[PDB]
Structure formats: structure tokens, C-alpha cells
């Protein structure tokens, strides 16, 4: 029908999302990369399920505060579109990678 | 009567501060030799229309259309040149001084060869369209682009105007002068100077940015140097061209043609020249149908256009093996590439500094680790520019490379 006004669709999206919590990420498409990464450190390392579940929680948990920090950086930038500049700058505040 | 006259020192104004020539007279017209180039122009009695004595020389108007702006004369040349003239012409010189009001209100007349502008029967200029190079219009912009043929003194570059709407008109005969195969044609060019996405085709003595809003030319004379530089992630590549003069919008200047390519710029090209003719022009190098990395594929053609060598990014691996680092400079933090003979600062602005032109360099320190080092460079022209935000390993790589360039570090 009428393609929707800008933002209004995404406003309904974020209103749908701010209540919700559960995983936006699949299990085995994530697990496959995780087991791939773990073998690079060392072979012969099995996983349990629940640790991977908690890590799939924890990675999203790390990313989401980063996302809102990046959003506040765009609020500073006063532009609708997101920017690659900010994250490094956020890490320039966070002292993560130098 | 007398048959000639001579002044080997008098000028004639040709498009700015043109220097001396050689007045010679004759009983039908004028033999003006150039004392610079030996160029002799001749005027006869069938040509004479007008001459008026201003602030000083024969400011003549003939039936060649020409505006003979002779100058470098003394005051009573008004007599003695007229002493050669007196018998025939039926023309004397007024003391005009066409206008000295300094008041803007007048009318422009498109001259048949010139461009006159009047303040109520009192004009200020009658300028031929040879004196302009190119021209754009606007509202109310009237752009008269003046490119000097290299006089070291004062040279006019641009005069724009308040012309009213030119109701039922425009810059008509203003835009009526000199006209300034496509060898190859490009598609989807990520333009950075100016910003946008336009294309450039390749013309016999120049090139052309074809675009949607603007449309620009790239002469083979105006180039200075092929620069070939990457992005530091090597996902992109910086296609920069050292140029002189910059191109303008009237407001900004484009000293360096900056373009952005990716690493993915990989396609075949087909040159619109014959297989003997590609090396009749190229000489054994650039064939009709080559391919590959367009950042290199285009620039191979660009080298044979410039007939000048390749600027290569250095092998200096700074922090994390990167070939550069960013630094805070001029409302921006941009990368600084080391080179064979210089440094280049992307992006806004592009600033190149050669090694030899540097007088010295110096540092400045805060106390904490977080990029407290503040590094400035003073050139031999007296100018010094300051580039902050340097870490300690960045200082190690920097300081070692500067010492490898044996540069005067004031400390």
C-alpha cells in the first residue's frame, strides 16, 4: 500500500523492541564461528550449551551499550545517519584498542 | 611631412600587466613591434576611429575592432605623437578620464569586440573578450574568469558583478567569445574535489568532468604531479592529482584533484585509439585493451598524460604496521602519508609539505600517555603547521622516520 513515512516504521520497530529481550541471533550460526575461534587458540576444547547461551547473551549485552553510546555520538553529530567515526572515538573514551 | 617616430620602451596592455613594446610610426599607420616577442602589429589610415588621452598613452580604437591600449608614455606625448598625426586623421584626444566617480551605478554595454561599462556617459572599462578565459553566470552572478599568462606582478583573476535580472536577457554577448574524439570515458566516479559522483571523459589536450550540476575541464598543461596513494585499511585508494591553478566555484579552490577508489576497482577498459595509434601516442606502453586495478589502470594512462613519474606510498610501517596515522588538524583528523620527498595530509584540507622545504620541526608534550604529543613543522617560507594527537609508539615510529629523513628537530 502506502509505503510508510520515514522513522514511523522504525519507531514502531524500536517500540516493539524496547520491551523485548530475547535473542536476535541464531544459535548454530553463532556457535559455528565460536567453535571456529576457539580452535584457533587451542584444539580439543568442547563446549557446553549453557555457557554458549550465556555468551550469546553477553556479546549482545556488550554491543547494545556500545550502540546507544554510538547513538549519543550521533546526537552530538546532529545527523540522522550513523557514523563509523564514533566507535573508535567511543573506544578512545573506553581505552579498549590502541 | 615626418615619416616615423620611435619609443623602444612604451607598453601595451595585453590581458593584465603586459610589459613594454616598441612604438614605430608611419604616415599611414602604426608599426608597433613587441620588444618582448618581436611581434609587429600594423595599423593603417583606413582603420582609425577614436583616440582620447587618459591617465597615459595612445588609447586607440581602430576598425580592426582592436582596443590599442598603448601606455608608458609621458604627458605631452599628447602633443608630440599628435605632431606626427596632425595632418590627416580628423581626430583629437580629450583629457578623459572616462570616469573617476567611484560610484557603482551604471549600465553595461556588450561591445562588439569589448565590454564597456558606463556611469552616466562616463565609462570605466571597455574590455575585450580576449582578456577573459572562461565564464559562468548566475543570479546575480556574472563570472569573468581571468587567467594570467604568467606576470609576476599584480594580475587580476576574477571580477563578478551585481547585474540586475537582465529582464528578458542574460549574459548574451558576454558569452560570445573563444571556445576555450573522446579518447576514453569513465563511469560512476566518486568525486571528492568537488564532492559528488560524476564522470570524466578524456579529450585530446585535456579531460572533462561531465556531471549533473557542474561540468569542468582538466588541461594537460595545468597538471603538476601524479600522486598515487591508498587508504590505510587498503579497502580504498586515494586518487589525488597535484594541480596548478586550482579550479573554482568562485568561492572555493581545488588545488588537488582528490578522488576515492576502492580496492575493488577492477575492470577491463577499451581505448578509443587504434592499435598502432595507442603506441604512436603512448610509444610502446599503453595498449588499446588493458584491464585490472582501475586505480592503477587509469593512472597508467594518467602518467603518459602527465609525462611525469609516479608518487608511491612509502614503506614506513608506523603503529600496527600502518603506513600512516591520523592527526587532529583544521577541523579534522586525517591521515599523514610519508613519501619519497614529502608528507601529504588527507583530507580536508589536502596539505603537502616537501622534505627539503622544511626549515625544522618540533614537538610539544602534555603529560599523559593518551596522544599528548603535539608535533609541528616549520618550513623555510616561515610558515609552521601543527598536528596534535600522537602516541608514544607513534612517536617512536615518527621520530625514527624523521631522523631517517635527517630533519632538524627543535627540542
Amino acid at each position: 500500500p502506502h509505503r510508510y513515512r520515514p522513522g514511523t516504521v522504525a519507531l514502531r520497530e524500536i517500540r516493539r523492541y524496547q520491551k523485548s529481550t530475547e535473542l536476535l541471533i541464531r544459535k548454530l550460526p553463532f556457535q559455528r564461528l565460536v567453535r571456529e575461534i576457539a580452535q584457533d587458540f587451542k584444539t580439543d576444547l568442547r563446549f557446553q550449551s549453557s555457557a554458549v547461551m550465556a555468551l550469546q547473551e553477553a556479546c549482545e549485552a556488550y554491543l547494545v551499550g556500545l550502540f546507544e553510546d554510538t547513538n549519543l555520538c550521533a546526537i552530538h553529530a546532529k545527523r540522522v545517519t550513523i557514523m563509523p567515526k564514533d566507535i573508535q572515538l567511543a573506544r578512545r573514551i573506553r581505552g579498549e584498542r590502541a | 611631412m615626418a615619416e616615423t617616430l620611435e619609443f623602444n620602451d612604451v607598453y601595451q596592455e595585453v590581458k593584465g600587466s603586459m610589459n613594454d613594446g616598441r612604438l614605430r610610426l608611419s604616415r599611414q599607420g602604426i608599426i608597433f613591434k613587441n620588444s618582448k616577442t618581436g611581434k609587429v602589429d600594423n595599423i593603417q589610415a583606413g582603420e582609425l576611429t577614436e583616440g582620447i588621452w587618459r591617465r597615459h598613452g595612445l588609447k586607440l580604437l581602430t576598425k580592426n575592432g582592436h582596443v590599442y591600449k598603448y601606455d608608458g608614455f609621458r604627458e605631452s606625448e599628447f602633443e608630440k605623437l599628435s605632431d606626427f598625426f596632425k595632418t590627416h586623421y580628423r581626430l583629437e584626444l580629450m583629457e578623459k578620464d572616462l570616469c573617476v566617480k567611484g560610484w557603482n551605478w551604471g549600465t553595461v554595454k556588450f561591445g562588439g569586440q569589448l565590454l564597456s561599462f558606463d556611469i552616466g556617459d562616463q565609462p570605466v572599462f571597455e574590455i575585450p573578450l580576449s582578456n577573459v578565459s572562461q565564464c559562468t553566470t548566475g543570479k546575480n552572478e556574472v563570472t569573468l574568469e581571468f587567467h594570467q599568462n604568467d606576470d609576476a606582478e599584480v594580475s587580476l583573476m576574477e571580477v563578478r558583478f551585481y547585474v540586475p535580472p537582465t529582464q528578458x536577457x542574460x549574459x548574451x554577448x558576454x558569452x560570445x567569445x573563444x571556445x576555450x574524439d573522446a579518447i576514453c570515458i569513465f563511469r560512476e566516479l566518486q568525486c571528492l574535489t568537488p564532492r559528488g559522483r560524476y564522470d570524466i571523459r578524456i579529450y585530446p589536450t585535456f579531460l572533462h568532468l561531465h556531471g549533473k550540476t557542474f561540468d569542468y575541464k582538466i588541461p594537460y598543461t595545468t597538471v603538476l604531479r601524479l600522486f598515487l596513494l591508498p587508504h590505510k585499511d587498503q579497502r580504498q585508494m586515494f586518487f589525488v592529482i597535484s594541480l596548478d591553478p586550482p579550479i573554482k566555484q568562485g568561492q572555493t579552490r581545488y588545488h588537488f584533484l582528490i578522488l576515492l577508489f576502492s580496492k575493488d576497482e577492477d575492470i577491463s577498459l577499451t581505448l578509443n585509439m587504434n592499435e598502432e595509434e595507442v603506441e604512436k601516442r603512448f610509444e610502446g606502453r599503453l595498449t588499446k585493451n588493458m584491464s585490472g586495478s582501475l586505480y592503477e589502470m587509469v593512472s597508467r594512462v594518467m602518467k603518459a598524460l602527465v609525462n611525469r613519474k609516479i608518487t608511491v606510498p612509502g614503506n614506513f610501517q608506523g603503529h600496527s604496521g600502518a603506513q600512516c596515522i591520523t592527526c587532529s588538524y583544521k577541523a579534522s583528523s586525517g591521515l599523514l602519508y610519508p613519501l619519497e620527498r614529502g608528507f601529504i595530509y588527507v583530507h580536508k584540507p589536502p596539505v603537502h609539505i616537501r622534505f627539503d622545504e622544511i626549515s625544522f620541526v618540533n614537538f610539544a608534550r602534555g603529560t599523559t600517555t593518551t596522544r599528548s604529543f603535539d608535533f609541528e613543522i616549520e618550513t623555510k617560507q616561515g610558515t609552521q603547521y601543527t598536528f596534535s594527537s600522537i602516541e608514544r609508539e607513534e612517536y617512536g615510529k615518527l621520530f625514527d622516520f624523521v631522523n631517517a629523513k635527517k630533519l632538524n628537530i627543535k627540542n
Partner: protein, 108 residues
């Protein structure tokens, strides 16, 4: 022994103070520990967790529902003041996010 009249019953509370001091003798943080030191912290925890549950019941009234969900917790703690600054670095399992919409993200 006799009747197990608890030290915690002599504190009138719930936490296993003898087992708490047993846990204290695991990390073994000094050669001796005062007897009220397991009492004091257990009292503190039983106090503060009760306030946490009191706020969680308020959030359940906000939910108008029955079972406490983990999304209530950011509804409690990320709406709190002393705990929110106090547990800022703490990430919350299945906590959700707070409803935080910017006014610049709104139309004319």
C-alpha cells in the same frame, strides 16, 4: 547437642550465619574474624534484597501480572538511583532495555 537455637534465630533472621562464617573461613581473609561480622553483612544483604523484592513487586503491579520476570530488574535497578550508579558496570541477564526515546526522534 541441644536444641539448634540459631545464632541467626538469636539475630531473628534467615541467613545461615554459622554457614556464612563457614564460607568466611574458606577465603580465609584474616587469622580471626569477629562473631558479629557474619551477622552484620548477612543482615545487610537480607535488608537490601528485601528492598529489591519490594521494588520488584511494584514492577509486578506495573505489569499487573503474577510471576516476576527478569525484565523487571532493569525496571527496578536501572530505574534505581544508588544501585543504578552502584551497579552501573553490572550487566543484567534478560533485563531488557529501558524505554529511552529521544525527542529529536519525533516529528513536527
Amino acid at each position: 547437642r541441644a536444641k539448634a537455637k540459631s545464632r541467626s534465630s538469636r539475630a531473628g533472621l534467615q541467613f545461615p550465619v554459622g554457614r556464612v562464617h563457614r564460607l568466611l573461613r574458606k577465603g580465609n581473609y584474616a587469622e580471626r574474624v569477629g562473631a558479629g561480622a557474619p551477622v552484620y553483612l548477612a543482615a545487610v544483604l537480607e535488608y537490601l534484597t528485601a528492598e529489591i523484592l519490594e521494588l520488584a513487586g511494584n514492577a509486578a503491579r506495573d505489569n499487573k501480572k503474577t510471576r516476576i520476570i527478569p525484565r523487571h530488574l532493569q525496571l527496578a535497578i536501572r530505574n534505581d538511583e544508588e544501585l543504578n550508579k552502584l551497579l552501573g558496570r553490572v550487566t543484567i541477564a534478560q533485563g531488557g532495555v529501558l524505554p529511552n526515546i529521544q525527542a529529536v526522534l519525533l516529528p513536527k
